[PDB]
Structure 1
């Protein structure tokens, strides 16, 4: 790993913290879409994309890769990752604070695993997916590409979620899909005074 890091990017601050938690001494913030074609003249420190938004993550990932930078994973030192889990190497993957990834799970490329999320044994988490704060996937769950799992959501064991799907905050997925969809919980209801 390099000693400084370029961070492209609120989610930028959190990525700075994870980078500094790993050995990084200096974070360099860039947030310039159009200046990106010139950035190839810069010293090749490690890069990270602190977006988003799957899908700007993905676009900018591709532009930065094609400009000769290495886009590393940021994994905080708190995360517990089984030696048999597969985390795509140098793939712009963010692994928060207190994440757990258990035996033979697979995390692909530019996934976000947000703080205290749990990926159980034998999960796949597809490319450019966002598993948010405290979201939990039970054993053998298959999350497709460009999915969003909202805060405190969960997925029961052995289930698949199709590409481009949204699981709302506090929702529990109970059924296999193959078709993309959106997947809401209950709403705290104000009690009337």
Structure 2
């Protein structure tokens, strides 16, 4: 439990964590430690020091910066709130290759992966993930803890509800609103508004029931 000072604590030790650790390192940040619900190790050289019960200990020793590297949107949002209650600040992990327009408003805890572009006047909620290669055109609104998967793309003026997930290569045409907790499958091309809490798949994307 002997750590260096000044680095970032990561919640989560999975594949998403690996990519986040490397984004932070590419920016010259140090990653201090991981907390993982499997408390057994290291992820890309970063020690796993315990489960979330280790958070108070980490804060006590002076570490105060944290990122939640958990892909699950509702779990990520809960763990973000837990981290803030424990006195951590949620950093953003923005790969140096990402292009984020100067008029974009970013929340906290946001992952913006390599190859991303986000254009003018888009707003990105806390704990959003904008994954590898994704594109966000002008005037989009991304709600807290939503996830745009790798190689997905939003055309202009799209709104994505809290905790919504767009799978790899999903596309949304201009002006469309997607509700909270909605899942667009890989490749789905969304051509009309989607309400909350549905799954939509296909070209064009259609809602799938039971």
How many pairs does the alignment contain?
Answer: 183
2:160 to 126, 134, 143: 143
Corresponding position of 1:77 = 96
**Unaligned runs of at least 5 residues, structure 1:** 187-193
Q: Kindly indicate whether residue 198 of structure 2 is the aligned counterpart of residue 181 of structure 1.
A: yes
Normalised TM-score (structure 2): 0.82
The partner residue of 1:41 within 60, 71, 78 is: 60
Q: Describe the SS at the equivalent of 2:89.
A: coil
CA apart distance, 1:85: 1.1
Does the 8 A contact of 1:118 with 1:137 survive in 2? yes
Instruction: Please give the alpha-carbon distance, in whole angstroms, between the structure 2 residues aligned to 1:28 and 1:21.
Output: 17
- Partner residue, 2:207: none
Please list, as runs of the form range in 1=range in 2, the aligned pairs for 1:1-193 lying within 5 A after superposition. Answer: 3-9=6-12, 10-31=15-36, 32-88=51-107, 91-185=108-202
Distance 1:26-1:147 versus aligned 2 partners, 3 A rule: closer
Q: Distance in 1 between matches of 2:120 and 2:195?
A: 25
- Please say which of residues 177-186 and 103-112 is displaced more in the overlay: 177-186
Secondary structure of the structure 2 residue equivalent to 1:133: coil
8 A Cα contact 2:6 2:32, kept in partner: no
Q: Residue 190 of structure 1 corresponds to which residue in structure 2?
A: none
TM-score by length of 1: 0.89
Q: Deviations over 1:61-87 (max 9, x none)?
A: 111101111110111111111111111
Runs of 4+ that moved beyond 4 A: none
CA distance in structure 1 between the partners assigned to 2:27 and 2:6 by the alignment? 10
Q: Show structure 2 runs of 5+ residues with no match.
A: 37-50, 204-210
